[PDB]
Design a protein around this ligand. Sequence first.
Ligand SMILES: N#Cc1cc(Br)ccc1O
Ligand SMILES: N#Cc1cc(Br)ccc1O
Length: 129
Amino acid sequence: GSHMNPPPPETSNPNKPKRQTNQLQYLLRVVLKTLWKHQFAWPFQQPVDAVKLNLPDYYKIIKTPMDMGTIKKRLENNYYWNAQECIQDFNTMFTNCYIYNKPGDDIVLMAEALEKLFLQKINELPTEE
Ligand SMILES: N#Cc1cc(Br)ccc1O
Ligand SMILES: N#Cc1cc(Br)ccc1O
């Protein structure tokens, strides 16, 4: 893509420690799956393309970008050590949306719908075994 967009977050790095846990399996098979098919998922399924959207300030404002396409790759590629890393990626994605956009904007309402589902599913995150 455009040189004006940053490289996406890392999804592969042999130096980084990782492991599978039952909680990470639940984050892929239940949490990500549920959110990915929501009617309002599409803006969040890949990094924000600030060039295409004519938002030249986006990566001036949002210095820790995250998206569900990145999270999907990180889960499928076993990038994470623990559930907390992955949950933090989701939280970063939501908070970027809420800091960049005005309350009540369409993308905000879309993010809020995904967040409500997310919180329901994370309340049920299984005990680590
Ligand atoms: N595991 C799983 C899963 C995740 C996404 Br996103 C879509 C379909 C699936 O079956
Ligand atoms: N945040 C954000 C954002 C994402 C898409 Br896709 C389009 C416009 C936006 O302002």
